[PDB]
Design a protein around this ligand. Sequence first.
Ligand code: HEM
Ligand code: HEM
Lengths: 145, 145
Amino acid sequence: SVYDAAAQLTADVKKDLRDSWKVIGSDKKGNGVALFTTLFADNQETIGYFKRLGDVSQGMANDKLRGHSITLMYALQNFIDQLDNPDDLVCVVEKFAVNHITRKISAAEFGKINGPIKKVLASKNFGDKYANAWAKLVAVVQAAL
Amino acid sequence: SVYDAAAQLTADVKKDLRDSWKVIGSDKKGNGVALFTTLFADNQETIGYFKRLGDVSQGMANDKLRGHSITLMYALQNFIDQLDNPDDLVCVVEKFAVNHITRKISAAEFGKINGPIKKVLASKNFGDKYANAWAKLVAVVQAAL
Ligand code: HEM
Ligand code: HEM
């Protein structure tokens, strides 16, 4: 279950998540757009899912894309803040899960975000250990899809 | 015009929003649920819009309501963080506006949140001065509906 997936996040993982978020989370507009734009360049098949955002190739200049990207980073902020309380983490994860379930996004497709996260982390010198920690957090969401 | 409304956020208004947010934003779960239990208590006619959350009268015990409430507080956090840049505040406001336009929520009904905000602020010893500052922030979203 989602609860089991959340309850598994260890102290070392939470530590790595929080330490890395201190940095990548400090510039939500910049890192959010980079994270999201990287998803398109590496997984072109997903572009169609974001038609509401207009021409996503416009990057930062696209106000809809910018608003979406900044807001996505606050979803992650939400997750990071609820780490010490699985019950709260679970209810916010399920809330965001519905938003994707309605868009027909499968657990496998949601996992496509791992590549982008790993790359953004690397641009800030956070290695594989940190990428693995984030994959574990993403896995919590996947348990809900 | 969302741009004209954003212009209404002067130095003094932004300061009050920040000062008050430091207090109410420190407990997103508690204050977030307080907002909704108040909204549904004072304006029962709005309950229908929230069918997905189930029995809202359950308050904190309702996982869907709690997840919803926490998430809402992060939208306000988003707004507060974008006060320095009107162009970024506008794009995040329009993003959330769409979420309500799709649910057929009008500017007038969105404004019903002012009552709960004033009550929650009052409970923390923040008077009309602060309630009015927040009413101006809500006005920015109303301009986009
Ligand atoms: C770190 C992981 C992710 C987070 C935290 C996240 C967060 C969000 C948030 C907050 C929204 C706005 C929900 C709404 O207002 O309706 C959203 C929308 C959406 N997401 Fe994600 N998402 C993630 C990954 C993905 C991935 C991997 C895909 C694609 C395979 C995806 C597809 C979508 C779609 C199609 C929408 C609707 C966009 C629109 O039309 O506004 N998301 N996401
Ligand atoms: C401070 C003002 C408010 C903010 C910042 C706000 C924020 C949000 C956010 C972030 C969501 C989740 C979006 C999504 O995932 O689709 C949401 C959903 C919603 N909001 Fe608001 N909202 C506010 C006031 C209101 C008011 C006053 C009403 C009704 C009169 C309203 C009606 C809705 C409805 C119907 C939903 C969908 C709930 C669901 O089925 O999950 N909102 N709002």
